[PDB]
Symmetry: D2
């Protein structure tokens, strides 16, 4: 079942540092296609992680596979940091326009979402001439010294490595589930906007805040969407004070949320800056920061550039990846399957009381499990047990914040495989309730 896989993981742990991996189970993938993973042992699973929302278009999509192998024969690499290639020129043009909004934009290439967010700090700082950056608790923007300082979802991203980047203030992200009693969405929006302002009313000058970076829906936080009114308040606040408005679309973008972009789950908001990564190259190492033209011109070279960034083989794969999304109606597909998945999960909650909250926007959801529906006490054990039952039954799914099931399969997932996956979870809950799982 996992024999060949375990023998190898045990040799990788001698040579590969434990800091670079979050460990759940022994999974040594041989190959995969669409939403199906096959390990070296021959076990087939249904993928509900999509490699951390990096494979919206499914594993080894033939169009993407072909682009890669085609481009590799011509030019594996020549750095855009010095010269020019057709795939990159084409892709920067396309990203500049498909980004939300109608203001002219420019693009800057990276290898990872992390460096894209580092870029955001740069551009924001150089454009405004201000130094302070506001980010959110519960957020995750990367592992580079800039984007890690912004993050607030793991204490291990601060431990033993400080001091971090100076001039960063964190604020709390609106939690609509663990609220005070009798609190409407409007009250939640107003409460969290009060917290948002307190720093600006005490030690943090609004005139010296370069920007505010926010995930329209916090991924690592537990698929938490900020209330519509809250986003508007913060948005208005930024433009009223010269503070750039930046979004992290690294995880929640490219159709994940049932719209091209997660910020498009909101009314008429265009970001000054935004980070795109992961799925852009179907898992290949490509990222980008997109921004209003005037902001992207604020820096002179080489303020922000990487040798391997905007790799032609990777740019080709992103060009195919985007054609796949538009041509297979993946954005629209996600909104639909996300609505059907929500229904089945809301129905599961009528039978399984442990499922405290069902958050879902497109094929993008968080299934928050608790010990009691009225106390909302996190249940890491129920959640932990559910996934293992899933793994042993051909479904790969993980957790966020211990007790929340992370549901983010490839957007191209066939309906047959979704019902097949949604069933195994239905069983997992019963299996857990009837005390049948002991990890």
């Amino acid at each position: 079942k996992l024999d060949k896989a375990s023998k190898l993981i045990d040799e990788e742990n001698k040579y590969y540092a434990r800091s670079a991996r979050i460990n759940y189970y022994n999974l040594v993938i041989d190959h995969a296609h669409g939403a199906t993973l096959v390990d070296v042992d021959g076990n087939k699973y249904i993928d509900l992680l999509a490699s951390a929302s990096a494979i919206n278009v499914g594993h080894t999509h033939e169009k993407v596979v072909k682009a890669i192998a085609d481009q590799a024969q011509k030019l594996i690499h020549y750095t855009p940091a010095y010269f020019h290639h057709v795939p990159g020129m084409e892709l920067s043009e396309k990203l500049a326009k498909i980004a939300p909004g109608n203001s002219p934009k420019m693009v800057s290439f990276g290898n990872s979402g992390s460096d894209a967010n580092d870029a955001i700090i740069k551009f924001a700082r150089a454009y405004t001439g201000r130094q302070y950056i506001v980010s959110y608790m519960g957020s995750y923007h990367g592992s580079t010294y800039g984007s890690q300082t912004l993050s607030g979802s793991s204490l291990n991203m601060t431990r033993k490595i400080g001091p971090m980047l100076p001039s960063v203030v964190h604020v709390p992200y609106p939690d609509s589930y663990r609220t005070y009693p009798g609190e409407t969405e409007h009250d939640v929006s107003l409460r969290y906007f009060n917290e948002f302002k307190k720093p600006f009313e005490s030690f943090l000058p609004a005139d010296e805040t370069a920007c505010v970076l926010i995930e329209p829906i916090q991924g690592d936080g537990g698929i938490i969407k900020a209330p519509e009114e809250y986003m508007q308040l913060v948005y208005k606040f930024c433009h009223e004070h010269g503070i750039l408005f930046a979004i992290d679309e690294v995880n929640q973008g490219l159709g994940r949320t049932g719209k091209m972009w997660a910020i498009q789950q909101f009314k008429d908001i265009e970001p000054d800056l935004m980070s795109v990564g992961k799925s852009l190259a179907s898992g290949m190492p490509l990222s980008a920061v997109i921004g209003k033209k005037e902001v992207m011109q604020s820096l002179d070279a080489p303020a922000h550039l990487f040798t391997t960034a905007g790799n032609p083989v990777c740019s080709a794969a992103s060009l195919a990846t985007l054609d796949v999304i538009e041509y297979e109606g993946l954005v629209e597909k996600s909104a639909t399957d996300g609505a059907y998945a929500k229904q089945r999960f809301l129905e599961m909650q009528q039978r399984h009381p442990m499922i405290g909250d069902v958050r879902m926007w497109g094929l993008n959801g968080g299934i928050e499990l608790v010990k009691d529906p009225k106390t909302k006490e996190p249940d890491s054990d129920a959640a932990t047990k559910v996934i293992y039952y899933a793994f042993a039954h051909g479904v790969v799914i993980i957790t966020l914040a211990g007790n929340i099931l992370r549901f983010q399969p490839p957007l191209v997932i066939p309906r047959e495989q979704l019902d097949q996956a949604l069933q195994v979870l239905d069983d997992a809950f019963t299996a857990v309730e009837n005390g049948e799982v002991t990890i």
Copy 2:
């Protein structure tokens, strides 16, 4: 116009793509390449003396690399090593552990770029030592991420308008063997620079609170300068006697570029606690790695250092094929031989062309420093611009460092006939510039 398409395409790209993301030289829209041969969209062929900033050690589109890229992609394009495992990456992390310089057990951590690798060095060093301070050199380049960019010291536009930078970082002067004082021997240089090295430790920087010294055995972007043997030994000793980790940046000078596997092996008996790799690691595919002594790498918990796409299975395959080409075609030796060849050729050119003030070369990695007057050693950026622009017009691509130093880093697999063409174009370029035939 030889560049009729290239110019038209760049005019559009400059509207959508930030200008800070590229150091502009020539209108070069590459269509395809192989070995040390590049072909633009207009059909013009060039000899590659830049190797995409030493990211193409084994030459463009090597069939083994191309094949590994195509084979691996079909089976699995990606699945993050930050959560799960794939065979190509398990194998590469093992190989990079043993081929790393020194004999101490080592562990590897993958990244995407040279920049994030050095960012990791800071963390691992800080985490292991329990100290916060980091020492790096002026004239260095470690990356474009907030950590590595703070360590760098080669471009004022890497500090400008993005401050404040990362705290607890101190810069020291890197030993310069060309612009020295009258009568200074190598021993004098080593001592003078080691003495500047100490000053901060003798004043405000506690040696006991310094997590590590990061250094380029040969500064690349700094103008291809090699630290004198004795200097490196003084520094290396000082670190050990004080519990400071000794880290090296091998992102540019590594993988057979200097004529050995690692630039550090040009120095006697030195094993680093931490080292950064990238670029040529996967023939230009985005893949880096930090490699350090086992006990250091273990000093951090997850997810202190990971990237979704770092250790990409396609890039891992690419890298294994790359490392195989270096071994099988004996590229390390070839660099040492053709390097030695290039060096003499350039030293002979210097005898006829006094604008060439200094010839620095180790493997097929060289800096040809151009100066107005050999006695004053005053930099001649205008001349070096002329040489390179003449070369471009004559089918040879080559850029500069620090304005006046010609950058010599072609793919290690370059055929002797093409190495000789390029050298002749360069020679011709020098004569052409002397006669005032080249206009910038």
Copy 3:
């Protein structure tokens, strides 16, 4: 009436930086005694400010004046950084014992409360080996880069002078007066302790937090005392995580609150570190950091010291100051006149509904003005009128946060003077209601 006063200030304003003063009145003091001020024109005023709670024992106190004169003849100054003098040895020993708690304590001198709070950062980091400091929004700790970074009461303390000291996190301070509908003190305490945790649950590791600095009662914030329950939750949390618990007694200490130390207004709380300043030497430049011996021995010379710090003249003045507090029973006097003062103001509140909130502990209080009781909207206009009517009727009083009247007279103030001052304040409110005062 302000002739000589105004002519002198015009001449001063060409030479003294405007940032070195917050301007109220053309008040040039020639001399003073007890709670009576006398300007260079002959006008008399009752002091309700006490040089910012720096004159607890009253102006030109016989004991304190004589002490200063006698010491200046024997030795104006010798630095304790290098050599010893008797007045300093007695002071450092005495303070070490009159500090709250019975754990053994050591003392280190400074010149102002600012540098003492800078010391607290040093000693905390040193002892714990941790780098992160947690301070409060709405706090004021000093004008030195360390203490200024910890501060949170004026955006002008951050502007144009950054970057600030790294590894500092700001948490909100419990606000009893402006709460949400139907909140009890218990809800306030739990809410604010809930905000306090968020950072430790996201990006701030408790295990890497050296300390938490807090004012038992925020002075600059507006005489805001934190709920007993809150404090205990914080204090307990600190001990469970190895986080030192620091207090800033610079403003609210030395009997100001009706007990020796503002921290003693809470139950069984001994700080690991405490800053003292202001009134310790009757306004002479002298401060101190007092901590548990094990904490203070964590530093080697000269990590923290000052040339003029622990000055023999300012040490003598302090010894005499502490003698007055003890001999004249000023701690008890403050508790009593404070209890009395509070009831008088509570009584003024019932008759004057522009008094939104009456915060008082000992002879120190904030009298917050509002436009409407239900809204609790700040009424800066009214407050400014009151303080100008006051000055015009021989009473010197300033505001905190624009709308809060700062009631902090010398502890030795005579009941008659106190009553006359209170009566003028009563008249002021009545006058402002009748529309009789415009500046």
Copy 4:
């Protein structure tokens, strides 16, 4: 008998007073003092050569200052200028703004210590220029507050255990004119050190982002080291050309200590943008001030920089008197005259005592650097210790700088008789060390 009472008071103070707040030399428990005379609790007399870190330029307990203190204490012990005004402070701030070097209008701002004055400099420079980076020197001491301590560079214990320190700060070497390279002239020294000064600016530090350069015209803590005239001129010019404010620390070397009113007046026509004053300003009473060109001092709104006790009416009275005494007694001139004499006394000594490697002196303000051998210049801290204890046992109080440098900064009023007494004792000390007659 001699220090028995002092050893019991000190044994008890060590239980309550932190060891970090004092540099321990001797069991000197002072009862009173006047001029350059110190008297312990046992009635022992000592000649003061430390002037309590040069905070007693006008001698201990000057009668005019004492009267100033007592008279004022009776009128008003304190009322903060942060909120209100008092005549003594208004007079002082006016006078400081005029006696400051240069003819450009100035504005003052009061603090309590040299430290907060230096933190203020950072603020003012950053606020005026809009730039963040500050440049200070190694071997410098500017204070114990987090800002000024970060600029400081004279002690490792001022950084240990307390970081991270204030960001955006770079340290540069100070010109050493004693431990030079063989054959170096003042010119050579000046150019070498100016060249080191530029390396950061030529590598990672953007000059257009450097708010200022803070410097001690003569380093006090460093060992009484004066920068060469030419060097200072070059740095001065560099600052003006790039908009970088030029700040000086006059806390230790100001108020007539060097033979001129300001240490910077030892150089030709150099007016600072910002400067810091303290110590002697108020004859030891806690008062400091930052002084700068008006336009610079107007770049902050309140309360960016203020202290409750800062500008205390008694301290200002003390300061006003101390300034009249300097003037009335011609102390500036006396520092130069008696400084020139003391310098010769020490040079005559150096002729018979070759352990005296260097005699640095400017006013009654010197550093007598003691070495093991004149050729090698190896520091002899052992000898220094012995000399200072021998001096202490024979009624002369004096301490060292950097372990091997004797610190010479008595009260400027020192009577010639006492000066010769002390001098003769230090001579006796050298002879005594020579003969191994002194054991610590």
